[PDB]
């Protein structure tokens, strides 16, 4: 997912931005630190995916 994020509008990367943080990131920090979450790789891939959305969002907004 790098062209897929590249082909939306600024509003839609703000939506999937807030959903990467909201649904994914926070619930996996809470789920990870409360004994659950066997699958730990999700933390990494979510974090890098927020990096992609902020990158494309900085590239799309202005310069």
């Amino acid at each position: 997912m790098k062209a897929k994020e590249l082909r939306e509008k600024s509003v839609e990367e703000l939506n999937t931005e807030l959903l990467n943080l909201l649904r994914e990131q926070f619930n996996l920090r809470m789920q990870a630190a409360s004994g659950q979450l066997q699958q730990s790789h999700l933390l990494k891939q979510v974090r890098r995916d927020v990096a992609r959305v902020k990158t494309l969002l900085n590239e799309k907004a202005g310069a």
């Binding site: 931005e17 809470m30 630190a33 409360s34």
Partner: peptide
């Protein structure tokens, strides 16, 4: 803002 407000809580403390 909600972006700030998600980064604040980090874990429930068990003791």
């Amino acid at each position: 803002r909600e972006e700030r407000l998600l980064k604040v809580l980090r874990a429930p403390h068990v003791s």
